[PDB]
Amino acid sequence: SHGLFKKLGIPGPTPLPFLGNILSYHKGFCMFDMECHKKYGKVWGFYDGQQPVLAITDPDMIKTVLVKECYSVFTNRRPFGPVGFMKSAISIAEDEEWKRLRSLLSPTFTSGKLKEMVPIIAQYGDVLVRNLRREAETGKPVTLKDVFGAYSMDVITSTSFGVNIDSPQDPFVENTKKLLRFDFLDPFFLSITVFPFLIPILEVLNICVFPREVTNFLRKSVKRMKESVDFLQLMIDSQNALSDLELVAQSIIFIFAGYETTSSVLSFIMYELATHPDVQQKLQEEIDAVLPNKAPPTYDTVLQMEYLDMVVNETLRLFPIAMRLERVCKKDVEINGMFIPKGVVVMIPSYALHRDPKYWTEPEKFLPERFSKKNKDNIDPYIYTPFGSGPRNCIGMRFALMNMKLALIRVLQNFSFKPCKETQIPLKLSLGGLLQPEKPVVLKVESR
Amino acid sequence: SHGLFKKLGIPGPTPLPFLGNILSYHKGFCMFDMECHKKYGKVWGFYDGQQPVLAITDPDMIKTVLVKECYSVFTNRRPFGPVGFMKSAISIAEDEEWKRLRSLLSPTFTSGKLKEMVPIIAQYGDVLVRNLRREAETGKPVTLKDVFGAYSMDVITSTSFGVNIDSLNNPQDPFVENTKKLLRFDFLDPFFLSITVFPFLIPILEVLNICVFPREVTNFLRKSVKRMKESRHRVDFLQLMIDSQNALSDLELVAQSIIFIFAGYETTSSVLSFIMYELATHPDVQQKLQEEIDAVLPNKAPPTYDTVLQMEYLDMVVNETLRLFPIAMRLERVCKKDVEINGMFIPKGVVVMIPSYALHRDPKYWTEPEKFLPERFSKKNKDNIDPYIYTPFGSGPRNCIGMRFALMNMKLALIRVLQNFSFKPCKETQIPLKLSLGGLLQPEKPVVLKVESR
Ligand code: HEM
Ligand code: HEM
Ligand SMILES: CC(C)(C)OC(=O)N[C@H](CS[C@@H](Cc1ccccc1)C(=O)NCCCc1cccnc1)Cc1cccc2ccccc12
Ligand SMILES: CC(C)(C)OC(=O)N[C@H](CS[C@@H](Cc1ccccc1)C(=O)NCCCc1cccnc1)Cc1cccc2ccccc12
């Protein structure tokens, strides 16, 4: 099965038996994709154990996989297990079950439902400032991942359920951060890749990848938040063909994503603003112009800030927390002049494309001017895909971009951030699996 | 009310009662703006009847009006009427209605939606050649505005609606026949003359169902969109407005279509004729552009989305022509409330005007402004170009929404034309070119040139 890419004439690194190319992951997904992007050109193929993975970089071919032939051929991502009851999650469900859940949960983030969340999110924006001011009055470096994580839990549990949780040591944030950490050193998610044919054994044994008492803590809490329109209400009205188990599976996804993804990116943004004060000061000047006298940000004033979008768009380029986009070829096809057999996982190296010298001038440097309306037209929509593309992109794309900018406005209105010497400069990404910094981001907070 | 610029200490020509300074328009808006720029300096004021108009030329002050204080102060243009149902047009809408329509029509001109239009526009690029080849196999002048208007109509009728209405011509197409007479702001007409001089007659004409656009042309386009709205195609301009309508209505939907039909036809054909006049009067520039097209597209290769953006000299030719001939001529914004921008007070109701034609030919920003020199926009020299002095498509949140589309449509046409033909003057060609001393920016005599096959 390791002679597939040799048959199709597609270049790639020589795979070892059983393992394939998984030993090259010692530097991580990101560094492995960038090396292969320079060695083999635009399209290459490697093996994740016995699973052939075809990497594509052509925007037209990326468009065909994610958009055009999505509902027909490239509908599902790479199979993940053992999951148990989490198989009904929209990010794990396949084919027919995904179509019914994609349309069911789509009205959650419309232009109207998002405008309803602005007065609700604005409450915790003051608790974020009032908690930062306690560690700001005094000269104590703030772990932004921590402070940012508590704010991300209140927003997702009030805009999706309507429950106030975080005020410190919160059981939701404590369990959500332990929900899943794909560590290739951890001998569980590793052997799943090399030996994917033992997943059927663990499913009939009621084994799961997510901790038991972390799922139970989230399974009984949704049953607790269900006592008699938001994300929760949109599903109970369709239940009265959801069940008492698929409803919990979607809440686990929304709570983890709304917490972990929002907090890590905001820490990535504040690092770049602290390492580039000319960008931070210029961004602080725009916030004071659209919102004078520290005016509360509304729904419309957020979409007006051009430079605030140019900074978030540039950070998501340097740190695409998804790293890769994957679609499973469900039947033999020939897209854009290339035959792709059934069973091959088509992969879009999002991290490798976001730093391509063929597309970006000085890609390693932080320059938010890449997304200015003068230079925005030079960006291909299939090379810069921080939220994916096609009918199966990020469902909370418009929600996350608003929720992060709602925090960046209220924080920069009152505080400026400086390095703390103990700040990791330059920031080392975790050479592990998920995209994160090695050392937690720490900065000095100075009130204005 | 004629002593506003006296009080503010802002210079300008002394206005006459009722008329104001509209008698100085006998040479057109362009020559009036140039003379005032030389007489009074960076800032001057005048009156369109009883309407004070403040002209600014400072890039920092222009940036504040168009970009910084757009949503708060300078959101709407000077009121235009009577318009009837066309009041809901994006170019005419105001305040909240314009903000809702701009966001609704923004995804129409993305880099992905435009890249989908290249194969469709590539069809009419060949029809443009075969119609020119007939007039080129026989020695005889040829009207560009004519051939260019037929091509521009097919591009807008198919990229926005998906309807092919000009099957290889069909020269007497009813769309082109009606669209050309949709509006010609002629100052000799006592109608548009009295509209600007006496503006309180607009509410009288509105209740009289009178419209500046003739009824026969509006009806022809009104019943055509209802004819095009069956749809039983991909995501285009007609599908985006229907998907959000399935809130828009069956006449705001037509109002935006009439705007897109006019701009895609009149603006594209007029600028293309200005380009070919400059290429025929500058054979070295035309040869240099022809040498670049054949280098990027050898063997007369079909133009694609990426090959168009790669041509650097083609962009310099289109940009320099837009400098000498900004069809917009002026940029106007209504100051909705009293402000003090860049240390200058502006009262509420004053229309701030940016003389785009005058700034493009300012001898203080351009060396030899009247001369046609594409090298101004070379990457060696483009750094010395202020984006608020050269504004052919406007600036800020209310710039030209079809800028990237019109730039691609004109470039796609110029490529497929220069690939097969070269252009020479005809003696009957007006050299030098006289601009229309009337309202809109057009030549006096139509541009005629001799077409030779390669
Ligand atoms: C900076 C923040 C975020 C980024 C960069 C991001 C990125 C992504 C990406 C790349 C995908 C896959 C797209 C594809 O495969 O084509 C995805 C899917 C998804 N995202 Fe996000 N995401 C973010 C935040 C969120 C949030 C706040 C939620 C809240 C519910 C969320 C929920 C989801 C779900 C449910 C899916 C799977 C949808 C499906 O498979 O149909 N994400 N996201
Ligand atoms: C050479 C071709 C063109 C030029 C030079 C041009 C130029 C301009 C300018 C200067 C403005 C006003 C900007 C401002 O006031 O700041 C404008 C507005 C506009 N243009 Fe164009 N344009 C062209 C072609 C087109 C095309 C093909 C369309 C197709 C739909 C179009 C649609 C519009 C619309 C709808 C507006 C109103 C924008 C708004 O009110 O928000 N234009 N154009
Ligand atoms: C590539 C391969 C085969 C190794 O692993 C996958 O293919 N499995 C992905 C992850 S499995 C599961 C893990 C999890 C569940 C609950 C809590 C924490 C982790 C899962 O359901 N997580 C969806 C979480 C929602 C989210 C996350 C980030 C951004 N936005 C939304 C499948 C996957 C789903 C959605 C987005 C993804 C983005 C990048 C990479 C993979 C993605
Ligand atoms: C300047 C003032 C105060 C006297 O009257 C305005 O303020 N009204 C301008 C134009 S009146 C209206 C008339 C019309 C509509 C449809 C067909 C024919 C005529 C209008 O909306 N025509 C916008 C058409 C789209 C277009 C045109 C040219 C370039 N690109 C797009 C407002 C205005 C809008 C858009 C572009 C303009 C370009 C140059 C000058 C004015 C422009």
XYZ file of N, CA and C and ligand atoms in Angstrom, chain A residues 66 77 90-91 98 102 109 253-254 257-258 261-262 265 316 321-322 325-327 385-389 392-396 399-400 404, ligand 1:
142
model
N -12.497 21.658 -2.017
C -13.251 22.221 -0.903
C -14.616 22.755 -1.321
N -13.854 14.475 6.383
C -12.457 14.549 6.778
C -11.939 13.146 7.091
N -20.910 17.549 14.440
C -20.908 18.062 13.072
C -19.514 17.991 12.462
N -18.474 18.127 13.284
C -17.101 18.030 12.808
C -16.632 16.591 12.633
N -24.141 14.883 8.394
C -23.512 16.199 8.390
C -24.395 17.235 7.705
N -25.479 20.541 9.511
C -24.927 21.791 8.997
C -26.021 22.828 8.783
N -25.342 31.531 13.714
C -24.438 32.658 13.526
C -24.834 33.511 12.328
N -18.441 20.554 21.210
C -17.645 21.184 20.161
C -17.680 22.700 20.300
N -18.866 23.262 20.541
C -18.998 24.713 20.624
C -18.275 25.274 21.841
N -14.295 24.899 21.160
C -13.839 25.819 20.123
C -13.952 27.267 20.583
N -15.102 27.639 21.147
C -15.283 28.996 21.630
C -14.342 29.381 22.751
N -9.920 28.048 20.971
C -9.497 28.747 19.762
C -9.463 30.256 19.974
N -10.428 30.793 20.723
C -10.483 32.238 20.926
C -9.349 32.716 21.826
N -5.615 32.505 20.007
C -5.371 33.509 18.975
C -5.178 34.884 19.601
N -3.746 35.376 11.978
C -4.257 34.087 11.528
C -3.455 33.526 10.362
N -4.236 28.044 13.506
C -4.358 27.018 14.538
C -4.830 25.685 13.973
N -5.438 25.690 12.787
C -5.862 24.445 12.161
C -4.709 23.722 11.482
N -5.929 21.364 6.321
C -7.288 21.052 5.901
C -7.274 19.689 5.227
N -8.227 18.833 5.585
C -8.246 17.464 5.089
C -9.627 17.088 4.574
N -9.643 16.383 3.444
C -10.850 15.817 2.861
C -10.519 14.426 2.339
N -6.545 30.385 3.920
C -7.774 29.755 4.401
C -7.623 29.429 5.882
N -7.684 30.442 6.753
C -7.582 30.168 8.193
C -8.817 29.499 8.768
N -9.969 29.611 8.103
C -11.206 28.984 8.554
C -11.692 27.923 7.574
N -10.820 27.452 6.688
C -11.234 26.526 5.659
C -11.976 27.232 4.537
N -12.754 26.449 3.798
C -13.531 26.969 2.682
C -14.628 25.968 2.347
N -18.059 23.130 4.034
C -17.667 22.588 5.329
C -16.522 23.399 5.924
N -16.656 24.721 5.913
C -15.675 25.590 6.550
C -16.019 25.718 8.033
N -15.351 26.635 8.728
C -15.663 26.877 10.130
C -17.056 27.481 10.261
N -17.916 26.826 11.045
C -19.274 27.323 11.226
C -19.302 28.561 12.113
N -18.308 28.736 12.980
C -18.249 29.901 13.839
C -17.217 30.914 13.395
N -18.606 34.359 14.055
C -18.727 34.516 15.500
C -17.375 34.773 16.153
N -16.341 34.041 15.733
C -15.028 34.195 16.350
C -14.398 35.536 15.993
N -13.428 38.044 19.026
C -12.038 38.411 19.279
C -11.834 39.916 19.162
C -9.798 31.797 15.396
C -10.822 30.954 15.580
C -11.135 29.721 14.690
C -10.479 29.232 13.620
C -9.191 29.762 12.948
C -11.195 28.060 13.152
C -10.846 27.270 12.077
C -11.577 26.211 11.579
C -11.230 25.397 10.430
C -9.974 25.575 9.551
C -12.186 24.478 10.265
C -12.229 23.391 9.168
C -12.650 23.996 7.833
C -12.445 22.983 6.739
O -12.081 21.822 7.056
O -12.645 23.337 5.548
C -13.175 24.666 11.306
C -14.319 23.919 11.484
C -15.228 24.060 12.510
N -15.238 25.069 13.454
Fe -13.788 26.491 13.699
N -12.288 27.868 13.972
C -12.284 28.867 14.923
C -13.215 29.025 15.928
C -14.383 28.307 16.081
C -15.462 28.623 16.992
C -15.500 29.825 17.961
C -16.419 27.702 16.857
C -17.736 27.706 17.671
C -18.674 26.761 17.547
C -15.982 26.752 15.842
C -16.656 25.638 15.382
C -16.305 24.851 14.305
C -16.984 23.649 13.863
C -18.234 23.028 14.524
C -16.341 23.176 12.792
C -16.710 21.913 11.982
C -17.843 22.241 11.014
C -18.058 21.086 10.070
O -17.238 20.133 10.090
O -19.051 21.121 9.298
N -14.736 27.160 15.397
N -12.771 25.735 12.087
